[PDB]
Amino acid sequence: DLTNADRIALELGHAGRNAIPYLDNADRPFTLNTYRPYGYTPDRPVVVVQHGVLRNGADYRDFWIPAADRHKLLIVAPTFSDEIWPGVESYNNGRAFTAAGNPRHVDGWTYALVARVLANIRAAEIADCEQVYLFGHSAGGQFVHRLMSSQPHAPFHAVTAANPGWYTLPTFEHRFPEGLDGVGLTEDHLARLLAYPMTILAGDQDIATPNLPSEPAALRQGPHRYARARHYYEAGQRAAAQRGLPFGWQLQVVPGIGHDGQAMSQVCASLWFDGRMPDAAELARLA
Numbered sequence: 001d002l003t004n005a006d007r008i009a010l011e012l013g014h015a016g017r018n019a020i021p022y023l024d025n026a027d028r029p030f031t032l033n034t035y036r037p038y039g040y041t042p043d044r045p046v047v048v049v050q051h052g053v054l055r056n057g058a059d060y061r062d063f064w065i066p067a068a069d070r071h072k073l074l075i076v077a078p079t080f081s082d083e084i085w086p087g088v089e090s091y092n093n094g095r096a097f098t099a100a101g102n103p104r105h106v107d108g109w110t111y112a113l114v115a116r117v118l119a120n121i122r123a124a125e126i127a128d129c130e131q132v133y134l135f136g137h138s139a140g141g142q143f144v145h146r147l148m149s150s151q152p153h154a155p156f157h158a159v160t161a162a163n164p165g166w167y168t169l170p171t172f173e174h175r176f177p178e179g180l181d182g183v184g185l186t187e188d189h190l191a192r193l194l195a196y197p198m199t200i201l202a203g204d205q206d207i208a209t210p211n212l213p214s215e216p217a218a219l220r221q222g223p224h225r226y227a228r229a230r231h232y233y234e235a236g237q238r239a240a241a242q243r244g245l246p247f248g249w250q251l252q253v254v255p256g257i258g259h260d261g262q263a264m265s266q267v268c269a270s271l272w273f274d275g276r277m278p279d280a281a282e283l284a285r286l287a
């Protein structure tokens with residue numbers, strides 16, 4: 001008799017950290033590692049945080065605590081374990097393919113779970129989800145931009161993909177995940193992707209050259225994540241211009257920060273909620 005909304009109402013009603021088992025993808029549970037600050041009220045923002053390759057959602061949720069306490073944000077980190085969601089295929093790439101290599105419908109992709117969880121937070125009356133912010137670092141920045149390529153944008157007020165290891169390029173020339181072909185996506189998905197004011201957040205010290213995506217499609221985008229971020233940005237610029245479409249993306253370089261999900265989390269919080277880049281002294285503190 002309990003629904004996911006009922007569960008969320010009971011688990012997210014009080015302040016503090018939590019790890020909420022969630023089952024939507026009938027056979028694949030995951031966890032919401034959450035933080036609710038004292039003084040959270042339902043009108044305040046919800047930040048969805050996506051972990052990188054380590055699948056350390058609890059850690060990512062912890063990185064956002066100081067910003068949540070200052071700004072009264074509800075932090076939700078959908079967490080996909082290596083055991084239940086193995087490999088880049090299940091997490092980074094959204095389980096886009098069946099085992100036979102045929103496309104699954106986009107509402108079955110791992111990405112589509114974000115909006116469902118949000119609808120449940122709203123049905124639980126925990127948050128009205130008017131202003132939802134979506135952040136992902138590394139594998140989770142791969143997840144976020146591919147979510148934006150494949151899913152409705154209505155639930156999301158702001159979206160930042162930080163230091164993705166490599167990118168799905170905005171073109172039907174290559175099969176997903178290298179491009180948008182072979183997965184039932186349309187030119188409308190592409191137009192909506194291009195229009196959205198997504199931030200690509202790139203540390204200019206993310207320039208080390210083992211966990212770095214090293215398949216040929218990743219290598220073609222550049223020697224390191226910082227180069228790849230610039231490559232993605234220009235690819236979107238060209239895709240929009242060849243189509244005469246509006247282009248909403250912003251490339252935001254972070255000076256002196258490398259591949260550091262905690263630093264990139266605090267920079268993102270600063271940009272979104274303080275309206276500013278931290279100063280050099282702060283950035284040096286974070287580095």
Ligand SMILES: [Cl-]
Nearest residue numbers: 004024116120
């Ligand atoms: Cl549901």
Ligand SMILES: [Cl-]
Nearest residue numbers: 178215216217
């Ligand atoms: Cl290839």
